[PDB]
Amino acid sequence: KVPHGEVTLVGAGRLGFRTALNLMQIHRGGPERIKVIDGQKVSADDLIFRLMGAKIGEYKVKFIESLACDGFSRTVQGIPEYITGDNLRLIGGDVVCVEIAGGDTLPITTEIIRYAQERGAATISTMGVFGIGEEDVSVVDIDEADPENPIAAYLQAEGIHEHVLVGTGKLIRDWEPVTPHVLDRVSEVMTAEILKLLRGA
Amino acid sequence: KVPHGEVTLVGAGRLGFRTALNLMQIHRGGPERIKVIDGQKVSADDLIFRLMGAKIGEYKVKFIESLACDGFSRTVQGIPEYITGDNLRLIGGDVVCVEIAGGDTLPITTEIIRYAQERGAATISTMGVFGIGEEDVSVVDIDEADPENPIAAYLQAEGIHEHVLVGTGKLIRDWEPVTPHVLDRVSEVMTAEILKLLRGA
Amino acid sequence: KVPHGEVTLVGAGRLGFRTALNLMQIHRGGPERIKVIDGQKVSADDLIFRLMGAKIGEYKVKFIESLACDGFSRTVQGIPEYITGDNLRLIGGDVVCVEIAGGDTLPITTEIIRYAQERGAATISTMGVFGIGEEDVSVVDIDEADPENPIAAYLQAEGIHEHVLVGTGKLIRDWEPVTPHVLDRVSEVMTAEILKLLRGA
Ligand SMILES: Nc1ncnc2c1ncn2[C@@H]1O[C@H](COP(=O)(O)OP(=O)(O)O)[C@@H](O)[C@H]1O
Numbered sequence: 001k002v003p004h005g006e007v008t009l010v011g012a013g014r015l016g017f018r019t020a021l022n023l024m025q026i027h028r029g030g031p032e033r034i035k036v037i038d039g040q041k042v043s044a045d046d047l048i049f050r051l052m053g054a055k056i057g058e059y060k061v062k063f064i065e066s067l068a069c070d071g072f073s074r075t076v077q078g079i080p081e082y083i084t085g086d087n088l089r090l091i092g093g094d095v096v097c098v099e100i101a102g103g104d105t106l107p108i109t110t111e112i113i114r115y116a117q118e119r120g121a122a123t124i125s126t127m128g129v130f131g132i133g134e135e136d137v138s139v140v141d142i143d144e145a146d147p148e149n150p151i152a153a154y155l156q157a158e159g160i161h162e163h164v165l166v167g168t169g170k171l172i173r174d175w176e177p178v179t180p181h182v183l184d185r186v187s188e189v190m191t192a193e194i195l196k197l198l199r200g201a
Numbered sequence: 202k203v204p205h206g207e208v209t210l211v212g213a214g215r216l217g218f219r220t221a222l223n224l225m226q227i228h229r230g231g232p233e234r235i236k237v238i239d240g241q242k243v244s245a246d247d248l249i250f251r252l253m254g255a256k257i258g259e260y261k262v263k264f265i266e267s268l269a270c271d272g273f274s275r276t277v278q279g280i281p282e283y284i285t286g287d288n289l290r291l292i293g294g295d296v297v298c299v300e301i302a303g304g305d306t307l308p309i310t311t312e313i314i315r316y317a318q319e320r321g322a323a324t325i326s327t328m329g330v331f332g333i334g335e336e337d338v339s340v341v342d343i344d345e346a347d348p349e350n351p352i353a354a355y356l357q358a359e360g361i362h363e364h365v366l367v368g369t370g371k372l373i374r375d376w377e378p379v380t381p382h383v384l385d386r387v388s389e390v391m392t393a394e395i396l397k398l399l400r401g402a
Numbered sequence: 403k404v405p406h407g408e409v410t411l412v413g414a415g416r417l418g419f420r421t422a423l424n425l426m427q428i429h430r431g432g433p434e435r436i437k438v439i440d441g442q443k444v445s446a447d448d449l450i451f452r453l454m455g456a457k458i459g460e461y462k463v464k465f466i467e468s469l470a471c472d473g474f475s476r477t478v479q480g481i482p483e484y485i486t487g488d489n490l491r492l493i494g495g496d497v498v499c500v501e502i503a504g505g506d507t508l509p510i511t512t513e514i515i516r517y518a519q520e521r522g523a524a525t526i527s528t529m530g531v532f533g534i535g536e537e538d539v540s541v542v543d544i545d546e547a548d549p550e551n552p553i554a555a556y557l558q559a560e561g562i563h564e565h566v567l568v569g570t571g572k573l574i575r576d577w578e579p580v581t582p583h584v585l586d587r588v589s590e591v592m593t594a595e596i597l598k599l600l601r602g603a
Binding site for chain 3: 001021022024025026027028029030052067069070071072073188189191192195196199
């Protein structure tokens, strides 16, 4: 009942930072190592980062890493890089969780899922995270996901299997914006499903 | 999916500060301008402000405005005044949200609602925020409210219509105090309701 | 509608610090005095403490007490000791809540309940706080608790009555770790239960 295994978080924006902070606080278990990959820096509009003391201009994943000082008994590594089909070498570990909103990320998300699964990682990603507050956050394997959701339809057409999707099913093309309470709820459910997948071994 | 519209928050105490922080974190939507109006300063008992970096003696609205630096892509204006009949003219914009407490607040709430409706704003306020933690938070138009609630009964007797009320329906006369978990639930629901009224405009 | 009564929190680790912070934030009621008793210092791994500005090496109860400065409307008495049979007289107040961190806590929890009851205090403790996110948190009197849970069975074997238990039912021996969202939910429910037991104080 000690930390075991490695989780890679691809995306450390408003959702991925929340999931990083949830995973870093797990005790009596959880991952022994967390890798967080994103090449973006803290901007004025990253209020959740700034309220925790991040400075404008800092890489988001360096701010995160800094919360794990010398005596921390799990390792947290911030990798300040944007993932393209050619730096997939940074993808490995036991669970790979991709958290970037929108449809502009789906080709890379699909490349990361394939690369991770062929190295034996379990994979998880989102199916829409928009919403004003009380929207149901649901969890589904890709083969049971609703084909009317364009993210599930695309991953199905790309032949993805054995892949967990989490979210509200509301997308950038729906009316709702992105709100902090919905991202807290998605991050809490993401964290639970990551732990279930880390139990796998 | 960009910020649009103006919301005025009257009251920036334990509840209104949480609503302001929720709206300031909305992406891909939410208001373009937030005006927060309260005369009071941070005191030692305002622990939620102190835990987020506020200094005792700072006006509550100046602390909130200070989170919106020059690069922030919405405008947040802190007005360090209590609303009275003399400066009702500070109330403007598309949605006015009243979250005040302390002494006799129903008469000025009624005045703010009458004036904001004259100016064409949509209006929302609270119908009791007391509770020890798991009390249901409900949302009603005033003329559909549960007639046992004494805030709705007062505003109905003052001829208020077309007004949204959110709360637990526990009030100062009930035995329960004000707890932080109930305030977070109230502020999440108020935020979602504000977004619905901003759309409607 | 002012603070009244005394709550003693035995344990100020990841769960007891959240319960202290909830009780410290209550407005228009709650306890007038909170006695927090723990002998432990903040370590690198106490991220929730460090994120709120605690320094490594500080006593957890003294960091907590430092939030209740001279202007604060309640007193917090941070007692930097562990409870043993030799210093049970430190337990006092109207409500005593045991949330002791580290495991192996049931013999001393039984002693604390017997002595608190002699003093006329109401008592509450946990029945398992492990969980990955959405586990039901339940509240039960010890004579109605399920004796298949080993904590309930032990305390029933030690002849404990008139004592509330709160938790998820998942223990150190189940697979699930301790996650921050489950500790938030357990502390929110414990805070509500403490305020019900405080009624009349
Ligand atoms: N007429 C008014 N105009 C603006 N703000 C007001 C007025 N009357 C009260 N308030 C503000 O309402 C806020 C209530 O905050 P608080 O006491 O923390 O209670 P709550 O937890 O209900 O929000 C205070 O900051 C107070 O200054």
